[PDB]
Amino acid sequence: MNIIGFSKALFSTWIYYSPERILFDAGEGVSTTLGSKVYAFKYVFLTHGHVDHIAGLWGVVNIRNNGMGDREKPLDVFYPEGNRAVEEYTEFIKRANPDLRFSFNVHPLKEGERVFLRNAGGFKRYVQPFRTKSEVSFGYHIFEVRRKFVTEEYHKKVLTISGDSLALDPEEIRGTELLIHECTFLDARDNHAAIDEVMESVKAAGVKKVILYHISTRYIRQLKSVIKKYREEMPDVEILYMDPRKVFEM
């Protein structure tokens, strides 16, 4: 029970990573799908300000302010610096519902800027935004600071979410313990990435587990086939995907 999410091209995208109690993006539906689980979120990291990536936030905050009782800690929301939609939306919520003014706080983030989560199991955990490949979009890394000569520290990439983007350069992805990569087009684009393009970076980076999301509803029937295909062309890499028609769970 590590990840539960939903992704549909232009309708809604939200991915809940529970180990660190983080919600990445918040398309409409999230609060309705997870009911009381929304009480467990400690952070929401927005990849972009489009509708289908933040409209579900209002429901998350409302449900939490209703059922967490007097014992409710504010929800921290991060989004890329300079996103007018997030600012206005967040301002609208408080304005519209004054009883929500304290239910959450928002925080602008700049590229490469770390955010310290907590210290557990002997390690410090951080989330860090990297710009995706106009409109500032962010992808995110969740890493642990570890020590492999005082000793030598290093970042252990526990998770990497791409957000809307093209196949990320293997360098940004090398070392991920779990890659959640967008995979809109199964071939010819209109910018979003094509699967051929994503799997290539995967190989170059030697990543062994990948979750493909934000799939076009059309590629459906063809999808279930392309994966079985790829899964066999890279027999050491675990490839999973979020079907545009169902809540994804792992």
Which own/partner contact pairs does 58-61 have at CB distance under 8 Å and 24+ positions apart?
58/89, 58/93, 59/28, 59/30, 59/31, 59/32, 60/23, 60/26, 60/30, 60/31, 61/93, 61/100, 61/103, 61/104
Question: Residues 42, 51, 186, 208: which binds its own copies (CB under 8 A)?
Answer: 51
Cβ within 8 Å of residue 175, ≥6 positions away: 155, 156, 157, 205
Neighbours of 84 (CB within 10 A): 8
Task: Give binding residues for Zn(2+) as ranges.
Answer: 48, 50, 52-53, 164, 214
**Which residue's entry shows tokens 């409409």?**
28
DSSP class of residue 130?
A: E
The reply to whether 247 sits near its own copies by the rule CB under 8 A is no
Question: Residues 5, 15, 25, 28: which binds its own copies (CB under 8 A)?
Answer: 28
| Contact region with its own copies (CB under 8 A), list: 6-14, 103-111, 122-130, 234-242 | 6-14
Q: From the CB of 95, what's the least distance to its own copies, in Å? A: 6
Q: From the CB of 221, what's the least distance to its own copies, in Å? A: 16
Task: Give binding residues as ranges.
Answer: 48, 50, 52-53, 164, 214
Helix (H, G, I), strand (E, B) or coil at 248: strand
Query: Binding mask 211-230 vs its own copies (x if CB under 8 A, - otherwise)?
Result: ------x-------------
Residues that bind its own copies (CB under 8 A): 8, 10-12, 27-29, 31-32, 35, 51-52, 55-56, 58-59, 62-63, 66, 84-85, 88-89, 92, 95-97, 217
